A = this chain, B = another copy of it.
Amino acid sequence: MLVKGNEILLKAHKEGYGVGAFNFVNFEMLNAIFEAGNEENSPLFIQASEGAIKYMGIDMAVGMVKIMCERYPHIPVALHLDHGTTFESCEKAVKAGFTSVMIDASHHAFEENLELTSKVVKMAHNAGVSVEAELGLVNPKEAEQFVKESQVDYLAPAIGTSHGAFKFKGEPKLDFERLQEVKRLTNIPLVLHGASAIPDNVRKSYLDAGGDLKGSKGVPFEFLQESVKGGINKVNTDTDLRIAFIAEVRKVANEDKSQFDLRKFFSPAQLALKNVVKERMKLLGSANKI
């Protein structure tokens, strides 16, 4: 059922594996994510950004997730506010039924990031909700201080990732020795943002359907595994899903100009998304952890 984000991530912290945190914006993405979790016997972090919540309405975002939990009552599921920008945003998500909220004030200085994060934590913990924060590259000693002062449940340390399909213009590399240092001093679950890899087969599908991925590329599979070894426990994944989904939508549009049955577009798009999720669960080590 729907559980506190910390319940899932504490396990992954103790046993040293990574749980994927998969964004959704509608029913098709959510269904494919849940089907993958059921087929790989993996716990699920379900994420909604503030833009996705505006698109769906927060009543629908939580409502659809609750329905899916009743459909697969054996899968541990956390519903996570992705990149909350204000206290009030995190507070609205708590009242709506989210079991995990992230407050992104990494763009602020240490002192204001910590003051706002601490405010979110108090409100959230009062309602039984776990909190993620961000910091950053990261400096391990202030991370130690940040975590102890804020009492946040998980932390996203900056180690060389960024959202989108365009992660590194040159060689891909992440500062894993910084990560191991953060992990030691904080001893809490850690979060990797911008962790989409753009698998080879997903890139092929998008470009085969006439898509333009520009010079985009993401974290190699090897560096996601090394991140988990370093102590990452929550791996944010979104771009990979969207590319795999829209590749199939473009394909159907191209191959049959007379097709306007929505299910003919989105049934193959769901399957491609679902396979990206299933492979990621195995890569990160959360398969068969229910």
Q: Residues of A with Cβ closer than 8 Å to B? A: 25-29, 31, 51-52, 55-57, 59-60, 63-64, 67-68, 70-71, 206, 210-214, 239, 242-243, 245-247, 249-250, 253, 257-263, 265-267
Closest CB in chain B relative to A166 CB, distance in Å? 11
Closest CB in chain B relative to A52 CB, distance in Å? 8
Closest CB in chain B relative to A98 CB, distance in Å? 16
Name the residue on B nearest A29 (C-beta): B262
Q: A25-B263, A26-B27 are in contact. Are A258 and B211 (CB under 8 A)?
A: yes
Q: A64-B63, A257-B210, A257-B211 are in contact. Are A263 and B55 (CB under 8 A)?
A: yes
- Taken together as a complex, chains A and B put the C-alpha atoms of A82 and B262 apart, in Å, by 17
Contact status A26-B262, CB under 8 Å? yes
Contact status B249-A253, CB under 8 Å? yes
- Taken together as a complex, chains A and B put the C-alpha atoms of A71 and B58 apart, in Å, by 11
Contact status B260-A245, CB under 8 Å? yes
Contact status A71-B57, CB under 8 Å? yes
- Taken together as a complex, chains A and B put the C-alpha atoms of A206 and B57 apart, in Å, by 29
Top 4 A-B residue pairs of the complex, sorted by shortest distance between their CB atoms: A212-B257, A246-B260, A63-B67, A212-B258
- Taken together as a complex, chains A and B put the C-alpha atoms of A246 and B258 apart, in Å, by 10
List B contacts of A68 (CB < 8 A). 60
Q: A60-B27, A63-B67, A250-B253 are in contact. Are A245 and B263 (CB under 8 A)?
A: no
